[PDB]
């Protein structure tokens, strides 16, 4: 389906422990591909997806003194907000900004994203039409008339239509085996009695990918989403997902309840029983 | 890849 | 625009000479460089705010600095005959990738023996 | 290990007809491109900037166009007046490997004549 290509930053200040804590990420869709964390014995962008290792050495040095410079240039915002709020020096303060487009199925632009945010609130965030701002308050609207005065949104623009869709192409056609190729999730139902009268009975769904994943009970075939314990999709370790929704069912109607999973992996949702 | 952009804040 | 002061320096080796600088008016940045004839121009050092940014392949006998009022000034001691080139002076906003820097008159420098 | 090279050093060519000027650099990792115009006496004038994502700017008579992933740029003058004459300089701004900021990288130039 839709695809997408994201890169998260964030910049933590240690006044004292020295130069602030780095760590940035990139991902397509839901695969970690790249990372560079300024705390490593070699500060350089490391490869996380095996399909991402055949980019020759330009492409590493390129990325290693991208991120470097970021590292650098948020070193400089972290002192300029501390006069923009009036804060001391002796606070700690986090920096965070993601960017990134997504694609359609046609490959074509279908949003781009460049938006900032400072102690976990919104700062400046480039609009839709990739030619305008939007400041959350009067000290990101220093920031929006500098970047407007150095035509900032023009590159952004021209990154968002042309690099950021050609190269989240390449990573797809790359990564076609992984990126395009859904993982349908292992699926089964267990029992778990609580009294003697009702008893608790939870649909699991391990291994899928992406982690969009629907799970939906059915009592005679009506959804009981009001009763359902439905926990957060989580990692397992292996660029998989997990998730799983239980229903407090009484002894005696286990067979009365179905569940439904919803994954693109699935040609077809798979209905199961307690078996 | 990585957008190429030095904007201070 | 940018100016530099002298417009033109005749000295002899071994001398030491400083060159002014002053950038627009706004500008945070100040950028110097040195254009000779085996060499174009070349990139020497670059202050923000009165703080070095980037630095080239400069030599230890060229000092440079930016004060409080933005300005600028390089000093070239011990001269030889190599350091005969036209030196110039560039300011930009800040340290914006997107925008452009601004070169003033420059400064002539011949070194004699 | 970022180098720029212009070619050729010298052009003269008579006046009105169209004009190209290439440049090329070894480090395909850059922030901008600018082409500058250095007349005798005096500075560099800023002529057009090409953003590291965009492809081509265009200003009055002027377009350069930029591909990275070749690492070439050319600058096209057409309808050449003798106003005109000056040595275009093709500069790159990029950083270097362990070092603290990026910086600009000029070309030697082209020393373009355009006889009346």
């Known amino acids: 389906g839709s695809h997408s290509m994201r890169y998260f930053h964030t910049s933590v200040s240690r006044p004292g422990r020295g130069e602030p804590r780095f760590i940035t990420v990139g991902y397509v869709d839901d695969t970690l591909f790249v990372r560079f964390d300024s705390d490593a014995a070699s500060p350089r962008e490391e490869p996380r997806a095996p399909w991402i290792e055949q980019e020759g050495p330009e492409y590493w040095d390129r990325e290693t003194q991208i991120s470097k410079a970021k590292a650098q240039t948020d070193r400089e915002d972290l002192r300029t907000l501390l006069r923009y709020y009036n804060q001391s020096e002796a606070g700690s303060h986090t920096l965070q900004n993601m960017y990134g487009c997504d694609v359609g199925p046609d490959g074509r632009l279908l949003r781009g994203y460049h938006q900032d945010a400072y102690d976990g609130k919104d700062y400046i965030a480039l609009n839709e039409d990739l030619s305008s701002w939007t400041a959350a308050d009067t000290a990101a609207q220093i920031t929006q008339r500098k970047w407007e005065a150095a035509r900032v949104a023009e590159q952004l623009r021209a990154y968002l239509e042309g690099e950021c869709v050609e190269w989240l192409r390449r990573y797809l056609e790359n990564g076609k085996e992984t990126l395009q190729r859904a993982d349908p999730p292992k699926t089964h139902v267990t029992h778990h009695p609580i009294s003697d009268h009702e008893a608790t009975l939870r649909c699991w769904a391990l291994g899928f990918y992406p982690a969009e994943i629907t799970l939906t009970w059915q009592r005679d075939g009506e959804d009981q989403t009001q009763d359902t314990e439905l926990v957060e999709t989580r990692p397992a370790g292996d660029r998989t997902f997990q998730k799983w929704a239980a229903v407090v069912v009484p002894s005696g109607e286990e067979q009365r309840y179905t569940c439904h999973v919803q994954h693109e992996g699935l040609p077809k949702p798979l209905t199961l029983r307690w078996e | 890849t990585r957008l190429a952009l030095i904007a201070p804040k | 625009g940018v100016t530099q002061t002298p417009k033109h320096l005749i000295t002899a080796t071994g001398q030491r000479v400083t060159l002014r600088c002053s950038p627009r008016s706004g500008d945070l940045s100040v950028y110097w460089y040195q254009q000779s004839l085996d060499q174009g121009l070349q990139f020497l050092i670059q202050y923000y705010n009165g703080e070095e940014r980037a630095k080239g392949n400069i030599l230890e006998r060229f000092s440079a600095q930016q004060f409080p009022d933005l300005h600028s000034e390089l000093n070239l001691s011990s001269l030889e005959l190599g350091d005969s080139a036209l030196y110039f002076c560039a300011s930009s906003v800040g340290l914006f990738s997107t925008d452009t820097q601004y070169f003033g008159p420059g400064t002539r420098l011949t070194v004699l023996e | 290990k970022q180098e720029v090279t212009q070619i050729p050093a010298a052009l003269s060519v008579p006046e009105g007809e169209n004009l190209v000027l290439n440049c090329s650099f070894t480090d395909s990792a850059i922030y901008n491109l600018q082409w500058f115009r250095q007349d005798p006496g005096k500075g560099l004038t800023s002529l057009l900037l090409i953003q590291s994502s965009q492809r081509e700017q265009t200003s009055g008579r002027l377009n350069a166009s930029l591909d990275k992933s070749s690492g070439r740029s050319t600058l096209y003058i057409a309808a050449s007046q003798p106003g005109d004459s000056a040595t275009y300089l093709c500069?790159?701004?990029?950083?270097?490997?362990?070092?603290?900021?990026?910086?600009?990288?000029f070309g030697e130039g082209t020393q373009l004549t355009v006889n009346p």
């Open positions: 500069a790159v701004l990029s950083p270097v490997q362990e070092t603290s900021g990026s910086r600009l990288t």
